């Protein structure tokens, strides 16, 4: 049977583009497409696609559950068995829901987190999707409660493949392949097992306006970047690490509150070190 | 002694052709004994030699969980490698890993190994001290920094000194009458004309185990190491091996040519000649 795939993503915004490819007998040409309810009835009145099928711009009519069959002239039937199924989900068709993490977005390696999706729109289903993934979004039935519908996605035990940027979507009862606009995104970062850095203040954590204070994140480990997070919920500052004469790797953040820092590496933005001990300024 | 255990992992992406695949195989010396293939409908670590078959269910369950986790890890590593090398998500790539331990006649660790490759070239390797890494390029140097920060080498060293050795010892006992009993080669020489001025002498070794063997041609006692065609050692399919060595000789000089066979299954080295 052929291998059917969607490129670059099966989850695609209205107005975007997606190409279905049907790989069979080491080629990508001469195939037919089918949708889940009509299983032996080819779409577009049995169109024989001469190459990959590009849908662009994407409309809600493209959303659906697809299989392909490839041409096979020298065989009993004219054609191959049905491919694996690919579900094209088209986003941008309802008001966006909301996504929050419990207890928070920084998740220790091996532990679990809940990503809750909710909306005052009654969505029959919710979908949770990590950016850039081929994995099918996770789906849960929505639960109605006090004028909202919501679902709890359990994520973990936490490892790198689970870390990244997440969005959630809703769908309404009779158009299950039509998704809402995406929720605002949430970065879920795995922490550990890389050794924690050290945090310090210069000249010290005692400061009175208006004099300058710089916090330094330092490690003997060769971190490429440091992240400074302050309890209380504005997004971390990031700075490149610099190697010092004594062979440590350090970044200086010129700025009260309670801070921690984390190291990370090149091309690896969603896995951070264990957190430093806290520092109150 | 001496013996080795090795695991070999292949993780491959194939965008548009199939889902990423992870295959692992385990060997004691030249004998494969387990396999795991992510393509299977319900992937499990599975026996590939009779002497491991009577191992209990906790073994198979534990190894299956470990392979499932490793498969996930290496699928992700394929994605990471794309970032390190600035490669497109359209191309097909392969990560390969081999690791394991060598032990002496007394069953004690002689050497530990852990080497990885990306697209068929060295990527990163554990050094002989089992406490430091050699990275082949700048991409691998990122991995090296992560592994140092996470103390990976200490954990791998603990595996290689501990479980790797203890389990190799157990398998060697479980399979003693096959794994620890060398099978000598059955040997013969064949003669194949080229013209009525030249001919080929081919020295054959069949049905030997382990795979290690030396076939040499001498002409009045001098190695023809410069003029010998040596075919790659090949599996017979029954856990024994085959090899041959050929030399082109002038007609009528066949008698100054001797084939020398060295293998652990042989009491004394063999010296054969065509007749």
């Amino acid at each position: 049977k052929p291998f059917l795939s969607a490129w670059p993503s099966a989850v695609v915004p209205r107005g975007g583009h997606v190409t279905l490819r049907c790989h069979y007998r080491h080629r990508f040409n001469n195939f037919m497409l089918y949708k889940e309810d009509r299983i032996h009835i080819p779409i577009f009145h049995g169109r024989i696609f001469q190459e990959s099928f590009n849908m662009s711009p994407v409309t809600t009519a493209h959303a659906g559950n697809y299989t392909c069959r490839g041409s096979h002239p020298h065989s009993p039937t004219g054609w191959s068995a049905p491919s694996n199924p690919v579900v094209i989900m088209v986003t941008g068709n309802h008001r966006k829901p909301s996504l929050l993490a419990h207890p928070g977005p920084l998740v220790k390696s091996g532990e679990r987190v809940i990503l809750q999706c909710w909306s005052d729109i009654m969505f029959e289903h919710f979908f949770l999707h990590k950016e850039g993934i081929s994995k099918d979004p996770s789906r849960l039935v929505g639960q109605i409660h006090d004028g909202v519908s919501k679902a709890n996605f359990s994520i973990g035990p936490m490892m790198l493949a689970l870390a990244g940027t997440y969005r959630c979507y809703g769908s309404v009862t009779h158009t299950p392949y039509q998704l809402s606009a995406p929720s605002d995104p949430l970065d879920i970062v795995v922490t550990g097992p890389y050794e924690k850095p050290s945090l310090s203040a210069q000249p010290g954590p005692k400061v009175q306006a208006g004099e300058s204070v710089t916090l330094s994140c330092s490690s003997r480990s060769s971190y490429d970047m440091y992240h400074l997070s302050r309890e209380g919920g504005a997004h971390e500052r990031r700075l490149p690490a610099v190697r010092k004469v004594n062979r440590t790797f350090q970044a200086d953040f010129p700025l009260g509150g309670t801070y921690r820092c984390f190291g990370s590496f090149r091309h690896s933005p969603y896995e951070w070190s264990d957190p430093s001990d806290p520092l109150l300024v | 002694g001496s013996h080795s255990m090795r695991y070999f992992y292949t993780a491959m992406s194939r965008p548009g052709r199939g889902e990423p695949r992870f295959i692992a195989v385990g060997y004691v010396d030249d004998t494969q004994f387990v396999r795991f293939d992510s393509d299977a409908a319900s992937p499990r670590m599975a026996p590939r030699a009779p002497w491991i078959e009577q191992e209990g269910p906790e073994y198979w369950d534990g190894e299956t969980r470990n392979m499932k986790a490793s498969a996930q890890t290496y699928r992700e590593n394929l994605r990471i490698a794309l970032r390190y090398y600035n490669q497109s998500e359209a191309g097909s790539h392969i990560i390969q890993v081999m690791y394991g331990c060598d032990v002496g006649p007394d069953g004690r660790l002689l050497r530990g190994h852990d080497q990885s490759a990306y697209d068929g070239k060295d990527y990163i390797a554990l050094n002989e001290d089992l406490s430091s890494w050699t990275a082949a390029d700048t991409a691998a140097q990122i991995t090296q920094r992560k592994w140092e920060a996470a103390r990976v080498a200490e954990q791998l060293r603990a595996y290689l000194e501990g479980l790797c050795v203890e389990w190799l010892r157990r398998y060697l006992e479980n399979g003693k009458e096959t794994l620890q009993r060398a099978d000598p080669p059955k040997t013969h020489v064949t003669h194949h004309p080229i013209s009525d001025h030249e001919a080929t002498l081919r020295c054959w070794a069949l049905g030997f185990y382990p795979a290690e063997i030396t076939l040499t041609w001498q002409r009045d006692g001098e190695d023809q190491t410069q003029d010998t065609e040596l075919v790659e050692t090949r599996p017979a399919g029954d856990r024994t091996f085959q090899k041959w060595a050929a030399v082109v000789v002038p007609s009528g000089e066949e008698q100054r040519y001797t084939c020398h066979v060295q293998h652990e299954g042989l009491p004394k080295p063999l010296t054969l000649r065509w007749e």
Binding site: - | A24, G26, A69, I80, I142, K146, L156, L163
Partner: peptide, 9 residues
């Protein structure tokens, strides 16, 4: 027995 040690790149 296979290695339990994770090798994340």
């Amino acid at each position: 027995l296979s290695s339990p040690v994770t090798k994340s790149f």
